[PDB]
Amino acid sequence: RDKRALEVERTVSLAEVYAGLPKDNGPFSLAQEIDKLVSQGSGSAGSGNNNLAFGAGTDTKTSLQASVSFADLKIREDYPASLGKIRRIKQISVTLPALLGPYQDVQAILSYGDKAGLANGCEALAVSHGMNDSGQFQLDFNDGKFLPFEGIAIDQGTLTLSFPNASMPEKGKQATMLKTLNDIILHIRYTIK
Amino acid sequence: NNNLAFGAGTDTKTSLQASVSFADLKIREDYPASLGKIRRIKQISVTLPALLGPYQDVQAILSYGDKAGLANGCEALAVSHGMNDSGQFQLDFNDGKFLPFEGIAIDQGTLTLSFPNASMPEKGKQATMLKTLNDIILHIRYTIK
Amino acid sequence: NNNLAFGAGTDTKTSLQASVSFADLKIREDYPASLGKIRRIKQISVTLPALLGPYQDVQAILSYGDKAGLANGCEALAVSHGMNDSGQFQLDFNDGKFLPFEGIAIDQGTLTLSFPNASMPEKGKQATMLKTLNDIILHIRYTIK
Amino acid sequence: NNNLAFGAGTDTKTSLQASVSFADLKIREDYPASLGKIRRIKQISVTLPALLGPYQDVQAILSYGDKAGLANGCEALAVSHGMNDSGQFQLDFNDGKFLPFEGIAIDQGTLTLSFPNASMPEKGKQATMLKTLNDIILHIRYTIK
Amino acid sequence: ALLGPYQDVQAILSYGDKAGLANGCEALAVSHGMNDSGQFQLDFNDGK
Amino acid sequence: GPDGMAALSLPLPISAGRGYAPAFTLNYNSGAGNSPFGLGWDCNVMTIRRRTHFGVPHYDETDTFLGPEGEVLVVADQPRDESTLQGINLGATFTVTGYRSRLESHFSRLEYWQPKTTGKTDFWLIYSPDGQVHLLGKSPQARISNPSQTTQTAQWLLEASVSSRGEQIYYQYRAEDDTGCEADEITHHLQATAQRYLHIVYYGNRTASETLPGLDGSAPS
Amino acid sequence: TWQDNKDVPLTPEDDNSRYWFNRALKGQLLRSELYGLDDSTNKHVPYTVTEFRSQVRRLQHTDSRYPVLWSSVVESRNYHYERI
Amino acid sequence: SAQRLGEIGSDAVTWEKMQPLSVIPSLQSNASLVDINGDGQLDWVITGPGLRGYHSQRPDGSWTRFTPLNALPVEYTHPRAQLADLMGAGLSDLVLIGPKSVRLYANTRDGFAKGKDVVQSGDITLPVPGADPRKLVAFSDVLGSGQAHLVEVSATKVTCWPNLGRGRFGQPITLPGFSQPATEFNPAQVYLADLDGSGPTDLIYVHTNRLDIFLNKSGNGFAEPVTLRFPEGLRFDHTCQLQMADVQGLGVASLILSVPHMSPHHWRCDLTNMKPWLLNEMNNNMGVHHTLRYRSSSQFWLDEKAAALTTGQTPVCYLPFPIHTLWQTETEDEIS
């Protein structure tokens, strides 16, 4: 039953996703809303599963996070049905085009909020710097274990990217970085079987 | 087998395809017969000299028409950047498995590159990319025994 | 053994060949005899100083014009890009198998480099390309035991 | 043990030799004794800053005097590039075999470097390349246990 | 920017509570000075 | 002045004129290149030219031209057709379009006459506030164009001009000619007559006219 | 802007417009002071001060790339201090 | 950062102790610093798995937010692609070069134009960069035209193909006068620069202990080389570098030899103290003698900076390059 799958890398701009939401879902400028949300914490932008907000838990109230559903990304429509019906994520990388202070790091967690049968720990990825980043210090597709987010269908579920010390009123260390940040880019490597 | 067309499949009608015949490429002719009679493809990569937008990807499938007996999945390759991409996120000649198109004779069959969402008035995407594409370049690695 | 000629074989009549003996290269004299009397070739790469454009190939075969108990296929190397080309798509000194020309004594036999489809009057494919070839460079990796 | 001379062997009198005493380098003193007493060489690479032509190699052998304590062949390293030669075509710390000079105490012994065919009156080759040699730099990797 | 291309730094980085570590894991040899580590080749996929 | 350049002016000894004359000055400009007058010096004889500030210009229609002061010419008005100039038969219908400099400073009007009829050449006319008309690049010799495709005119050199009171001036250029230059000097270039030099300027009319002295392109006696 | 043949005050409607309006003033002298250099107590004051006010008139912008401007000095002053 | 050394009036130029930059754009791993707009502001340009775009650096050191671009060539990252001006516009375009044709993507400032294949006229055959290790293939204004021509330097001659725009080249022409022993000749030792300063670039061949400088006769070949010697104790090898810049603001670049080895050393060879071909003097033979002196605008900026220091008046520089200006003149009466 094995087959060589078609390996496809999809660049995703969250700014395009939010700017492009249906009028009724509250489209927005990602850079503009982040700035407002950082300067004044505990706000929100967008709607449903395509939005910006501060985390609800006490542990996360200073954390600003963005989220997008796969259903809205509609990656699936990029390719015809004749190539196969099963389309699943193999690896997700993250890029953050912000300016940094002289020795500043970027802290962020990308996670699948719809955790199900996915092996333990593969529901989330850490960002340390961006640049097509990864949850592993070394990325190896021949690792032997499942990679973060591997096996998630490209058709449904929500990814959320959390920035731990984003609230400006709390003097979060990432607040200036986020005001500075222009977009969020995901690189989704998925395969078609 | 040396043409362009929009595909006839149910979901290929807005997909622009370019087909080429291996026989018509006249590759066998490159080396003397005395070097060996078996000349077959080991690996194919694709280069697309076009312009891309900031988050624009190449979305294209290269496939070999005949189901000649290759292991399942080796009949096709996906292109993402168009820069001698090959068929893997991580390329390894020593993978242990057969590579896309491995074992196909350089002599025969039709190879086709498909670009979905190529038709313009249909609100395509590759439709804009393609306006700047000056060629389709294949890099064919084959061996002689 | 130090010459140019068109090949005499049936399918080599349009193939331009160059031949250089190993003995006349005086490789042995590079290092003192007391350092080791056994000097054998490990790997040979080929460089062709020619104006090959970004998508232009060079087609040539380097072969050992002699016989020894060499592994089958180690008698020859294919040149494609002309930039330290190896005989492998991926060169690996730790491949586990013998490399082309591995174990050939540094001062024995001769090498021949063939260029198929070179004759100009025959409209050979490489007939005009070769007008820009200003030298042939070999890179020989050998070891001393 | 810190001098220049021509070699005294029958095939070395045209070979220019350089030498150094490890004891005189006193590398040991660079670090405190609190870190351990056993300090041994892991690997030595050689840099020979010089001005050579595009196809011009440098030829020299780096060797260790008391060869008796080493695995066969670890007593010497060949230098052919001059940039940063580790000698071995493929450097691998996980190779599985011992590296040249590995295990030599940084504390003692004489290391030498020869250039065969260096005497200009004998029409050597290193004889002219050496005129541009500005220094000899060794890169010594050693470990403290 | 401390060292030029052929200059070395001799420095040892070490952890105070060495008692919980495997022998030699209590210290690192700094010598290259440019994001270096305690081993000539860093490999997180190794077995040690 | 504002850019810190060094400069000198050496007027030519042209004493003759009738209230109108081809008066030129040789000027030093530091930072200037090698001209017909040596490195750093020129006379800047007036010309209309394609702008090269953005690279090799097109010889098509999406072209940018500079006015005589060296400034961008913007199409000022809409084209009209005309077969004569000042009563002189030009031998063909031309389409003429007016231009105006992007940054005004003189209020002159510039016309571009582009032959409607294939086989004729184009020309430019400057209508000066003083009531003067200046014709540039009408005939070969006054034109800088690709020797391999001579229709690709890059520059239009002043050929003729007339004042309102009847005095007119004609400018004769001599093209580069490969005589006595040395074999490699000719062999590695083979430009086939590129570059023009001002050779002689004719002024002081025996007969008055309000028309341009170049007439239909005929040479002066 | 030259509207109905009047020199009508203008606020550039955008930045490209503003760019061209600023470009048009290039090279214009804005101020010139004549200042004596000596050891007197008047070494701190100019003999004269000349001030200029320039303007740019928009004449034609049918060619959106190069919106034909005319610039000059609309007004100027000359103060005579004699270093007092 | 550059600063004037000592008081205003002290011409020497030095640099301040290095400081970390207060703001650095992220995404530094697959990027380079190139002005791609011709703005004067260098752009940190990022390429890779999408993320095409850049951060420009403003005169106050402020970096812009990421700019996405609207058209980067796939071939931008091709192993042989060059950055060269083949339009003549001064922007730096993207090009691949073969022997008969080139593939050129014009720089449109916000991205690149559709690439075009340009076939050369007649049988003009172009040199191909990297094709022959014994020759230097590079763009340089060897003819002094301001356009940058394609030049091939061999041990025996310099061949040049004029840049006619849009990827079109003229026929090769010979530029005689350059010569080195053929075996020893190594393009790695060949550097081109307008040390003269009038336009056409000179050819500097580096040897241990010396420099051979072939002067460019305005595109008509070369002058017999000037051999300059190094100071005793100064040598040169393949690890050593040659930098070229007008670090002192003289209008002429100086040659800086950078020697690493066990202790870095840097040597500056000034060829002249003044930019050649500027008019220096005038005399009317009636008793009036004139003389001129010139200085880089960049030295005047350093004074503006020195004045800003102490006073805190941040000297933001809006003039990115050293236009050379007239500084001082004198006029003398030979009679009185």
CSV table of N, CA, C and O in Angstrom, one decimal, chain H residues 237-292:
chain,number,residue,atom,x,y,z
H,237,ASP,N,50.1,36.8,-0.3
H,237,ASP,CA,49.7,35.4,-0.7
H,237,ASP,C,48.2,35.2,-1.0
H,237,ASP,O,47.5,36.2,-1.0
H,238,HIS,N,47.8,34.0,-1.3
H,238,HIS,CA,46.4,33.7,-1.7
H,238,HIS,C,45.5,33.9,-0.5
H,238,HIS,O,44.2,33.9,-0.8
H,239,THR,N,45.9,34.1,0.7
H,239,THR,CA,45.0,34.3,1.8
H,239,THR,C,44.8,35.8,2.0
H,239,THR,O,43.9,36.2,2.8
H,240,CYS,N,45.6,36.6,1.4
H,240,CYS,CA,45.7,38.0,1.6
H,240,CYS,C,44.7,38.7,0.6
H,240,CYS,O,44.4,38.2,-0.5
H,241,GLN,N,44.1,39.8,1.1
H,241,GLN,CA,43.1,40.4,0.3
H,241,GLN,C,43.6,41.8,-0.2
H,241,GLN,O,44.4,42.4,0.4
H,242,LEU,N,43.0,42.3,-1.3
H,242,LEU,CA,43.2,43.6,-1.7
H,242,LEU,C,41.8,44.4,-1.8
H,242,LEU,O,40.9,44.0,-2.5
H,243,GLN,N,41.8,45.4,-1.0
H,243,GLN,CA,40.6,46.2,-0.9
H,243,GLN,C,40.8,47.5,-1.6
H,243,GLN,O,42.0,47.9,-1.7
H,244,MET,N,39.8,48.2,-2.1
H,244,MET,CA,40.0,49.4,-2.8
H,244,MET,C,38.9,50.4,-2.4
H,244,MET,O,37.8,50.2,-2.7
H,245,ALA,N,39.3,51.6,-1.9
H,245,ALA,CA,38.3,52.6,-1.5
H,245,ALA,C,39.0,53.9,-1.3
H,245,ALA,O,40.1,54.0,-0.8
H,246,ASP,N,38.2,55.0,-1.5
H,246,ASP,CA,38.7,56.3,-1.1
H,246,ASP,C,38.4,56.6,0.3
H,246,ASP,O,37.7,57.5,0.6
H,247,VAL,N,39.2,55.9,1.1
H,247,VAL,CA,39.0,56.0,2.6
H,247,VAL,C,39.4,57.4,3.1
H,247,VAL,O,38.9,57.7,4.2
H,248,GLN,N,40.2,58.1,2.5
H,248,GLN,CA,40.6,59.4,3.0
H,248,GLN,C,39.9,60.5,2.3
H,248,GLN,O,40.2,61.7,2.7
H,249,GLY,N,39.0,60.3,1.4
H,249,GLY,CA,38.2,61.4,0.8
H,249,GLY,C,39.0,62.2,-0.2
H,249,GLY,O,38.8,63.4,-0.3
H,250,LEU,N,40.0,61.6,-0.9
H,250,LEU,CA,40.9,62.3,-1.8
H,250,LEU,C,40.3,62.4,-3.2
H,250,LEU,O,40.9,63.2,-4.1
H,251,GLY,N,39.3,61.6,-3.5
H,251,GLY,CA,38.7,61.5,-4.8
H,251,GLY,C,39.2,60.3,-5.6
H,251,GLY,O,38.7,59.9,-6.6
H,252,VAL,N,40.3,59.7,-5.0
H,252,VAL,CA,40.9,58.6,-5.6
H,252,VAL,C,41.0,57.4,-4.6
H,252,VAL,O,41.4,57.6,-3.5
H,253,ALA,N,40.6,56.2,-5.0
H,253,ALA,CA,40.6,55.1,-4.2
H,253,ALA,C,42.1,54.7,-3.9
H,253,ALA,O,42.9,54.8,-4.7
H,254,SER,N,42.3,54.2,-2.7
H,254,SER,CA,43.6,53.8,-2.3
H,254,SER,C,43.6,52.3,-2.2
H,254,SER,O,42.6,51.6,-2.1
H,255,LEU,N,44.8,51.7,-2.4
H,255,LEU,CA,44.9,50.2,-2.4
H,255,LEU,C,45.2,49.7,-1.0
H,255,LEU,O,46.3,50.1,-0.4
H,256,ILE,N,44.4,48.9,-0.4
H,256,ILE,CA,44.7,48.4,0.9
H,256,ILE,C,44.9,46.9,0.9
H,256,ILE,O,44.1,46.1,0.6
H,257,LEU,N,46.1,46.6,1.3
H,257,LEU,CA,46.5,45.2,1.4
H,257,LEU,C,46.2,44.7,2.8
H,257,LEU,O,46.7,45.2,3.8
H,258,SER,N,45.3,43.7,2.9
H,258,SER,CA,44.9,43.1,4.1
H,258,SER,C,45.6,41.8,4.3
H,258,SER,O,45.3,40.8,3.6
H,259,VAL,N,46.4,41.7,5.3
H,259,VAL,CA,47.2,40.5,5.6
H,259,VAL,C,46.7,39.9,6.9
H,259,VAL,O,46.7,40.6,7.9
H,260,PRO,N,46.2,38.6,6.9
H,260,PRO,CA,45.7,38.0,8.1
H,260,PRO,C,46.8,37.3,8.9
H,260,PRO,O,47.4,38.0,9.7
H,261,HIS,N,47.1,36.1,8.5
H,261,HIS,CA,48.2,35.4,9.1
H,261,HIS,C,48.0,35.4,10.6
H,261,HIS,O,46.8,35.5,11.1
H,262,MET,N,49.0,35.5,11.4
H,262,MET,CA,48.8,35.4,12.9
H,262,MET,C,48.5,36.6,13.6
H,262,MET,O,48.4,36.7,14.8
H,263,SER,N,48.5,37.7,12.8
H,263,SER,CA,48.2,39.0,13.4
H,263,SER,C,47.9,39.9,12.2
H,263,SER,O,48.7,40.0,11.3
H,264,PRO,N,46.7,40.5,12.1
H,264,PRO,CA,46.3,41.2,11.0
H,264,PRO,C,47.1,42.5,10.8
H,264,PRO,O,47.4,43.1,11.8
H,265,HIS,N,47.3,42.8,9.6
H,265,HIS,CA,48.0,44.1,9.2
H,265,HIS,C,47.3,44.7,8.1
H,265,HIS,O,46.9,44.0,7.2
H,266,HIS,N,47.3,46.0,8.0
H,266,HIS,CA,46.7,46.6,6.8
H,266,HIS,C,47.5,47.7,6.3
H,266,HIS,O,48.0,48.6,7.0
H,267,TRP,N,47.8,47.6,5.0
H,267,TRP,CA,48.6,48.6,4.4
H,267,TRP,C,47.9,49.4,3.3
H,267,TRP,O,47.4,48.8,2.4
H,268,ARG,N,48.1,50.7,3.4
H,268,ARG,CA,47.4,51.6,2.4
H,268,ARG,C,48.4,52.2,1.5
H,268,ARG,O,49.3,52.9,1.9
H,269,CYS,N,48.2,52.0,0.2
H,269,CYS,CA,49.1,52.6,-0.8
H,269,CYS,C,48.4,53.7,-1.5
H,269,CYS,O,47.4,53.5,-2.2
H,270,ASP,N,48.8,55.0,-1.2
H,270,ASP,CA,48.2,56.1,-1.8
H,270,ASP,C,48.9,56.3,-3.1
H,270,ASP,O,50.1,56.3,-3.2
H,271,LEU,N,48.2,56.5,-4.2
H,271,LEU,CA,48.9,56.7,-5.5
H,271,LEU,C,49.2,58.1,-5.7
H,271,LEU,O,50.1,58.5,-6.4
H,272,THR,N,48.3,58.9,-5.2
H,272,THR,CA,48.3,60.4,-5.4
H,272,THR,C,47.6,61.0,-4.2
H,272,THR,O,46.8,60.3,-3.6
H,273,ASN,N,47.9,62.2,-3.9
H,273,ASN,CA,47.2,62.9,-2.9
H,273,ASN,C,46.0,63.8,-3.4
H,273,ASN,O,45.2,64.3,-2.7
H,274,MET,N,45.9,63.8,-4.8
H,274,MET,CA,44.9,64.6,-5.4
H,274,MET,C,44.3,64.0,-6.6
H,274,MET,O,44.9,63.3,-7.3
H,275,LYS,N,43.0,64.2,-6.9
H,275,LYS,CA,42.4,63.7,-8.1
H,275,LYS,C,42.9,64.3,-9.3
H,275,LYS,O,42.9,65.5,-9.5
H,276,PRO,N,43.5,63.5,-10.3
H,276,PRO,CA,44.1,63.9,-11.5
H,276,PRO,C,43.1,64.4,-12.4
H,276,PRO,O,41.9,64.1,-12.3
H,277,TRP,N,43.6,65.2,-13.3
H,277,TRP,CA,42.8,65.8,-14.4
H,277,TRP,C,41.9,66.9,-13.9
H,277,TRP,O,41.3,67.5,-14.7
H,278,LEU,N,41.9,67.3,-12.6
H,278,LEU,CA,41.2,68.4,-12.3
H,278,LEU,C,42.0,69.6,-12.6
H,278,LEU,O,43.3,69.5,-12.5
H,279,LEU,N,41.4,70.7,-13.0
H,279,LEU,CA,42.3,71.9,-13.2
H,279,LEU,C,42.8,72.3,-11.9
H,279,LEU,O,42.1,72.5,-10.9
H,280,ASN,N,44.1,72.5,-11.8
H,280,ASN,CA,44.7,73.0,-10.6
H,280,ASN,C,45.1,74.5,-10.7
H,280,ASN,O,45.0,75.3,-9.8
H,281,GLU,N,45.6,74.8,-11.9
H,281,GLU,CA,46.2,76.2,-12.1
H,281,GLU,C,45.8,76.8,-13.4
H,281,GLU,O,45.6,76.2,-14.4
H,282,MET,N,45.9,78.2,-13.3
H,282,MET,CA,45.7,79.0,-14.4
H,282,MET,C,46.5,80.3,-14.4
H,282,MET,O,46.7,80.9,-13.3
H,283,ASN,N,47.1,80.7,-15.5
H,283,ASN,CA,47.9,81.9,-15.5
H,283,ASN,C,47.8,82.7,-16.8
H,283,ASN,O,48.1,82.2,-17.9
H,284,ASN,N,47.5,84.0,-16.7
H,284,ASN,CA,47.3,84.7,-17.9
H,284,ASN,C,48.5,85.4,-18.5
H,284,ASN,O,48.3,86.2,-19.4
H,285,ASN,N,49.7,85.2,-17.9
H,285,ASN,CA,50.8,85.9,-18.4
H,285,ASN,C,50.7,87.4,-18.4
H,285,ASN,O,51.5,88.1,-19.0
H,286,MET,N,49.8,88.0,-17.6
H,286,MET,CA,49.7,89.4,-17.4
H,286,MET,C,49.9,89.7,-16.0
H,286,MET,O,49.8,90.9,-15.5
H,287,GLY,N,50.2,88.7,-15.2
H,287,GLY,CA,50.4,88.8,-13.8
H,287,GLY,C,49.4,88.2,-12.9
H,287,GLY,O,49.4,88.3,-11.7
H,288,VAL,N,48.4,87.5,-13.4
H,288,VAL,CA,47.4,86.8,-12.5
H,288,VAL,C,47.5,85.3,-12.5
H,288,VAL,O,47.3,84.7,-13.5
H,289,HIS,N,47.8,84.8,-11.3
H,289,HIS,CA,48.0,83.4,-11.1
H,289,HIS,C,46.9,82.9,-10.3
H,289,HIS,O,46.6,83.4,-9.2
H,290,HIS,N,46.2,81.8,-10.7
H,290,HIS,CA,45.1,81.2,-10.0
H,290,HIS,C,45.5,79.8,-9.7
H,290,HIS,O,46.2,79.1,-10.4
H,291,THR,N,45.0,79.4,-8.5
H,291,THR,CA,45.2,78.0,-8.2
H,291,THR,C,43.9,77.4,-7.5
H,291,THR,O,43.2,78.2,-6.7
H,292,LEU,N,43.6,76.2,-7.6
H,292,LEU,CA,42.5,75.5,-7.0
H,292,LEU,C,42.9,74.3,-6.1
H,292,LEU,O,43.9,73.7,-6.3
